């Protein structure tokens, strides 16, 4: 139904700068949720941008168009 705890943990560990850093179990589940929301937002806004153009197929242009606002919204 979404991202796996182990995938999310590995994803984060990839970027930690401190060898001390750990993540508790519920933070992981919560983060898996947040990552799910972000993918689905990326997808919906790209979709949104496409049928706004009266197109049923979403292309990389639609993705590119909605990208800046999507990222600002997750800052």
């Amino acid at each position: 139904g979404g991202f796996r705890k182990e995938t999310v943990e590995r994803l984060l560990r990839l970027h930690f700068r401190d060898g001390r850093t750990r993540v508790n179990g519920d933070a992981l589940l919560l983060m898996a949720e947040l990552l799910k929301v972000f993918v689905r937002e990326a997808a919906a806004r790209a979709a949104r941008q496409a049928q706004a153009e009266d197109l049923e197929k979403v292309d990389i242009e639609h993705v590119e168009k909605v990208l800046p606002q999507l990222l600002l919204d997750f800052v």
């Binding site: 990839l14 401190d18 001390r20 919560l30 949720e33 919906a44 049923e56 292309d59 993705v63």
Partner: protein, 98 residues
């Protein structure tokens, strides 16, 4: 050597690509559109990349509180700028541990 990290990176990219594919499949049904394989892949790459900022922030937000272990409080702080999202994630969290 360094090629271990690169293999780990292609692994994680591929795992994110699969889940991204699954999630995009759902959105394409609700919205009744089609997501080109190129689009799914791009959304996946973006998402993978975005984990760099999430991870950096979680780590620093916890450290800010003098904590080595990231908690649900840190993840909620990630969602601060958005009241609807914060409420969603706040709700998710209380829906979790309980």
């Amino acid at each position: 050597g360094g090629e271990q990290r690169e293999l780990l990176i292609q692994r994680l990219r591929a795992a994110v690509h699969y889940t991204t594919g699954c999630l995009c499949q759902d959105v394409a049904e609700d919205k009744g559109v089609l997501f080109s394989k190129q689009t799914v892949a791009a959304i996946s790459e973006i998402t993978f990349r975005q984990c760099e900022n999430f991870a950096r922030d979680l780590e620093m937000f916890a450290r800010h509180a003098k904590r080595s272990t990231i908690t649900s409080e840190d993840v909620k702080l990630l969602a601060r700028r958005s009241n609807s999202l914060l409420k969603y994630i706040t709700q998710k969290s209380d829906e979790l541990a309980s």
